[PDB]
Amino acid sequence: GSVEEIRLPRAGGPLGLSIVGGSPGVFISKVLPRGLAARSGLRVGDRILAVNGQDVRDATHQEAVSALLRPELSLLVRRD
Amino acid sequence: RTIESKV
């Protein structure tokens, strides 16, 4: 497995993704072809490990949702 | 059970 650091420039618009899982793990389920997530390297199946340094490895689904949206955003993901 | 959150 591989780990990558993704960077999405916060623009007050749709980040361009959808996530599933939590309490095991938050995985990206959809990536808009025209969205920010697709333009910045995100892919379906990636596990979100950290949101701007906050560890979301074992975060609840809503814990991850707040981290993602609560106010450039850095996502560290695991990818196989 | 399952949630999909569009952000």
Numbering used by the authors:
A (entry chain B): 10 to 32, 44 to 91, 94 to 102
B (entry chain D): 11 to 17
Text of the article:
Scribble is a highly conserved regulator of cell polarity, a process that enables the generation of asymmetry at the cellular and tissue level in higher organisms. Scrib belongs to the LAP (leucine-rich repeats and PDZ domain) protein family, and features sixteen LLRs (Leucine-rich repeats), two LAP-specific domains (LAPSDa and LAPSDb) and the four PDZ domains (PDZ1, PDZ2, PDZ3 and PDZ4). The influenza A virus NS1 protein was shown to bind to human Scribble (SCRIB) via its C-terminal PDZ binding motif (PBM). Examination of the SCRIB PDZ:NS1 complexes showed that the NS1 peptides are bound in the canonical ligand-binding groove formed by the β2 strand and helix α2.
We determined crystal structures of SCRIB PDZ1 bound to NS1 ESEV PBM (A281-R219-T220-I221-E222-S223-E224-V225), SCRIB PDZ1 bound to NS1 ESKV PBM (A281-R219-T220-I221-E222-S223-K224-V225) and PDZ3 bound to NS1 ESKV PBM (A281-R219-T220-I221-E222-S223-K224-V225). In the SCRIB PDZ3:ESKV complex, Val225ESKV is docked in the conserved hydrophobic pocket formed by SCRIB PDZ3 Leu1014, Gly1014 and Leu1016. Additionally, hydrogen bonds are formed between Lys224ESKV-Leu1016SCRIB PDZ3, Ser223ESKV-Ile1018SCRIB PDZ3 and Ser223ESKV-His1071SCRIB PDZ3 at the α2 helix. Glu222ESKV side-chain reaches over to the β2 strand and forms an ionic bond with the Lys1039SCRIB PDZ2. Although SCRIB PDZ3 K1040 formed an ionic bond with ESKV seen in the SCRIB PDZ3:ESKV complex, it appears not to be a critical contributor to the overall affinity, with loss of the interaction only modestly reducing the overall affinity of the SCRIB PDZ3:PBM interaction. SCRIB PDZ3 K1040A showed a weaker interaction with ESEV (22.2 ± 1.1 µM) and ESKV (13.8 ± 0.8 µM) compared to the wild-type SCRIB PDZ3 counterpart (ESEV:13.1 ± 1.6 µM, ESKV:12.1 ± 0.9 µM). SCRIB PDZ3 H1071A revealed complete loss of binding for both ESEV and ESKV, whereas PDZ3 K1040A interacted with both (ESEV: 22.2 ± 1.1 µM) (ESKV: 13.8 ± 0.8 µM). Our ITC analysis of the ESKV PBM revealed an interaction with SCRIB PDZ2 (KD = 9.5 ± 0.7 µM) as the tightest interactor, followed by SCRIB PDZ3 (KD = 12.1 ± 0.9 µM) and SCRIB PDZ1 (KD = 30.0 ± 0.9 µM) as the weakest interactor. Interestingly, there were no significant differences in the interaction of SCRIB PDZ3 (β-PIX:14.7 ± 2.1 µM, ESEV: 13.1 ± 1.6 µM, ESKV:12.1 ± 0.9 µM). Additionally, S1026PDZ3 interacts with the β-PIX W641, whereas S1026PDZ3 is not involved in the SCRIB PDZ3:ESKV complex; instead, a K1040PDZ3-E222ESKV hydrogen bond is formed.
